Amino acid sequence: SYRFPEGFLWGAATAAYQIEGSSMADGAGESIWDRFSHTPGNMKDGDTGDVACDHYNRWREDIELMKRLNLQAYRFSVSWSRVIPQGRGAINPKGLAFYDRLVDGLLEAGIEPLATLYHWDLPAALDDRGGWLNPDIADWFADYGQVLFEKFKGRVKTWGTINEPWCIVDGGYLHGALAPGHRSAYEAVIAGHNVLRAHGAAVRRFREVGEGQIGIVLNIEPKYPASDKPEDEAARRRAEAQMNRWFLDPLMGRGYPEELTDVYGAAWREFPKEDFELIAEPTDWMGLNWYTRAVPENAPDAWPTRSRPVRQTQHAHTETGWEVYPPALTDTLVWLSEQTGGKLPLMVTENGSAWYDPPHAIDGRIHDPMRVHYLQTHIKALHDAIGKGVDLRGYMVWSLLDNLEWSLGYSKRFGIVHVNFATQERTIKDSGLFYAEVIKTHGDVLN
Amino acid sequence: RSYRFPEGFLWGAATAAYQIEGSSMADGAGESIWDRFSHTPGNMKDGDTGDVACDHYNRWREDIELMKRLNLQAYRFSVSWSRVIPQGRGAINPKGLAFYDRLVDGLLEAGIEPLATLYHWDLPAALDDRGGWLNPDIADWFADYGQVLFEKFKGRVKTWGTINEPWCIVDGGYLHGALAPGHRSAYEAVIAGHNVLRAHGAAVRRFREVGEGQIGIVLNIEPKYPASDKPEDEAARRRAEAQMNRWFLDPLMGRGYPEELTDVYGAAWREFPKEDFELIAEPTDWMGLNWYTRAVPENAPDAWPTRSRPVRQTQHAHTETGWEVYPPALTDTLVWLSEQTGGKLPLMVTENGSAWYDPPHAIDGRIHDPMRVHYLQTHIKALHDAIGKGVDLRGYMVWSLLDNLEWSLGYSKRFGIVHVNFATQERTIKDSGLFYAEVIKTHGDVLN
Amino acid sequence: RSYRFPEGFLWGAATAAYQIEGSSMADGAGESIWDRFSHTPGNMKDGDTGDVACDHYNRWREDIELMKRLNLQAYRFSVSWSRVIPQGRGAINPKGLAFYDRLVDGLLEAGIEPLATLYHWDLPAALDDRGGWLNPDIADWFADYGQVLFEKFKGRVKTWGTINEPWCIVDGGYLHGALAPGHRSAYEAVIAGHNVLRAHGAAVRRFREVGEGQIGIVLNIEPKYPASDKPEDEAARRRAEAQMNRWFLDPLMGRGYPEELTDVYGAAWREFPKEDFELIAEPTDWMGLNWYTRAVPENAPDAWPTRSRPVRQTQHAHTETGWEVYPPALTDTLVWLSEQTGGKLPLMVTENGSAWYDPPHAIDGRIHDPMRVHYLQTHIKALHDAIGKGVDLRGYMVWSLLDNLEWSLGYSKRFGIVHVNFATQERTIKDSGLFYAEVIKTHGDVLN
């Protein structure tokens, strides 16, 4: 049987810059992605988030779609620069009003709104003050958090602080593939620390003025052994430490992983103890974003982890080049349960896959059998995790809509709903239809 | 084409006491006319009785959990007169009243609106021994019975039905004898119909004196369509229509008895005192419609007493009870009823559903009943059309919540959206139930 | 002259939690502002506290038997917020809630209608440490508290009061400091009044979302009569009237705050956001009037802050609390109130009564209080007169069922129609209680 526990929450997820469009509309400020996406060479095919899914204007239709998919929850992000154009100071009434209407529309539809404070779109005005390199950001973020905490008190009960610190730092400051496009280990170390601090500050502020549950959202990519060679095991631990333990360990009060000292070398720093007290501020829940695993081997020229993944040719790969391997989800869920002591309620805040779909519907249909396969096998893997005692409270499919996959542009479709970006026409994919059955039957359809 | 229903539109399912409860004479419960009738050989298919039925008397909690799983907002049920007052008059049976007390509290705790029916065909045998519906004093007896309930559940049961389908009671019970008490007499039928109407009026008055909320009657209507252009067939149609659809509605609306009845019942027809019609026409707050099908009557000189017979409509599907599936006739009927009641009387579909064959046990935890699903979706759409035509329709109750005893046809006719394995009493939600749960959740939008 | 009251007119008696219960921090119960206030020297007459009071928390069953002896049809009581939610927010206290559960079931069993008040001056101290009525979040806090009750007693408590006497709470608690929490500030008074109104609105909205029945606020009114024809005295009268009788009623009726308040509070007066007034004016189902007396204000330049003072009306009797006895002013007030609410809002006298000296013990099993009897008969007659003048008055609650703690004035002021010997907790029904019982029994005919 695959019936899920009582109260288990099924939903789907999005992010502001990836779907909203209208980036400068109605008072909204400039974000780092406004700058980044309009700089030549940064984005595939020169794609930008200027229009995206036009969600800012078509959110009502999108909610009708959520209802057709039988969604019980919708996880979304709030654009900081849309709400506070300069990052600090005067609030933008219309910008806040958008999310106000959105949340009311969701509650009317019977859909639980899951809000994320930061999904990679820092206000440019704050980037001009150093962004995540400026320790004061811990306060800025907190204040920003407060604006929402008070505005949606009693309506938004489940809060995420930061979405994937590792992507923000590794993509934004270490390798520069993401906004703000810096490439520096020194900056990567500092930015990671201040992201954690910002999370802690926001949680404290939430304790003072908020109502409900708050937590961080981490992505994890489990690193499997390439061989029994010791240099490869050392490589595996470097990669695992840099990607999976960098943020989790200090969040659990265990400090930074020792291996980071080797990974970042002269760029590594010692931080004040009270910083770690702030960072480990107790949370109510944790989100896991999960897609795949990796099999790292030693790679002396790979900066900075000196490791590289070994291609697992025995399995299918997504268009983002990610191995399809459902058991590794179960394992990860087990592992995380151990790291949090079984004491912290967990939720899969993102899971999904990118495969090729045509740019238009084919007489009113999009047939994506591999996305369907991914969905069913990984959800079964969730059931396996719950059977092993992991406290899993919910599952959010990434993503509700085909959207802007950041620097990879619109070429990577993660949606269970197809978006024709020429016409903004939405078409429910076979995967969405199937997910609607999984929700409807509460998992029994997998039988 | 949208199918979202009006704000406050109430979704539910319906049952009746003798058809589901069992334990009919248990815990002080009195003997009813159906206790006698069902234990007389030849009266019931396969010799089925209501002795056990769905064992609801013991398993009502499980049944409430099933109501919650179906997202029901209302539960329409009947109270067994003989369970509450074993001799029909006099001493109350505490355990019997306590059952409905627990039931109603359990419903309210579940957030489900209790819709109570005073009389659903199970007259106490002690009152039948005093002439039953042939005795005018029943108008008082019924009222007194009603009072007991009105005061016991004051503030908890806000929506009350008096009589469920006067026509089935009289035509089946007194005219043709297919139902309890099994009499066959036009003379008795006329009197019984009249006293049922009077009893309804008396109950409404008593409700005005001691009750709280809304009270009304529940009528079944089977619209009669033309079979041909022959005038004798039209006369046949009007006879059938008068005897079945206008017999009770008309005096309830102050129009007296249909004149055609004079021809239908002949020497058995009677004139009744003028004040009786005043009692019968006591203003009500709402009316229930029980609806399943239509008929296409033609002339049949040897058919007693309406001299009519239905013509089989072979172009359409028929249920296990032989009823034509024809959803537009629901819409028409609702409109018609709205017109007969002047548009001023709030209406509710208190019964609608269909019987199809289901296996006696679930098959891998399931019952696949696609025809019942089809009936459900098309007729609910027909409700939407009726509302679009200005009918003041406030709710819809599916007959039935459970597979149960279909009276004289026994357990062979399954009307439930929840399957009952009568060997094990195990309940299994049918595909029709799952779909109805979807209709309620989306408030009709799933039909889009 | 007949004095028969309307059909359904509800007779009852009233109490408040801190005034009768005792056991204030017992069985998980939290600390309230009155726990703190009453145990600070100088605050209470004779150093009296609510530690024991009428020991009602332990003797509620005996008290219910007393209600039955008085023929009460209703019992108006308040729920201690800190007894149910010790810290004001967060965890519910099961034993505390269980007390009121038992109480309500016992009342319903006795055939007595429970009229519940959410807030009767006993704020949890933990919320006072967060600013109390000065903190806007209290509007939410109160609502959540309200929800706990609304759902716990859904279907059992059908009539709800939100706030008992905003004016006493703010004027006594924040303006002059004679009541808990003992602040003395016009600035704080203005803010507190605003947030009490907001809290009422929030509770009404929450009640619409999760509750069942009728909900309303309870206001005290002390009608201000002319002292002379001097214009400064009329200006004084209008200041006093605005500050006491119109401060809360007007925004509740959507008329905004009285203009005169700008003059009364001066630099302490504030403008509040417009949506607050949308919240404050949330439609209610009924309104309670607490009434005892009138005043005859004259100009008094040194009287802070209304610059007015009452003129002693020596032509009439005065109660032991120093209140003039003048029954016509009750009639007038009701009429006035009827006019202010447009006649559309059902009214109930939630408090009326008088304090006179009684001995601390019964005298051969009796307490002879002829002036309290007199007050009762004349003011009930005044109620009848008010109804004859078109006031939609549905009921009357005598303050109080029991001799109790008259807050800062302690046990020295006896308002009970039932005498309480505070040395022994013995209850003795006073002559006034006997007479009131006869008034209820005859539905007013005894006044003839």
Ligand SMILES: OC[C@H]1O[C@@H](O)[C@H](O)[C@@H](O)[C@@H]1O
């Ligand atoms: O790369 C696919 C997805 O990965 C997730 O971890 C990020 O939160 C999304 O913003 C992104 O679209």
Ligand SMILES: OC[C@H]1O[C@@H](O)[C@H](O)[C@@H](O)[C@@H]1O
């Ligand atoms: O014939 C099916 C159903 O018909 C309805 O009109 C009656 O009220 C039910 O008791 C019966 O089970």
Ligand SMILES: OC[C@H]1O[C@@H](O)[C@H](O)[C@@H](O)[C@@H]1O
């Ligand atoms: O001041 C005397 C009385 O005033 C009433 O309006 C309050 O509700 C009582 O608690 C108090 O005993």
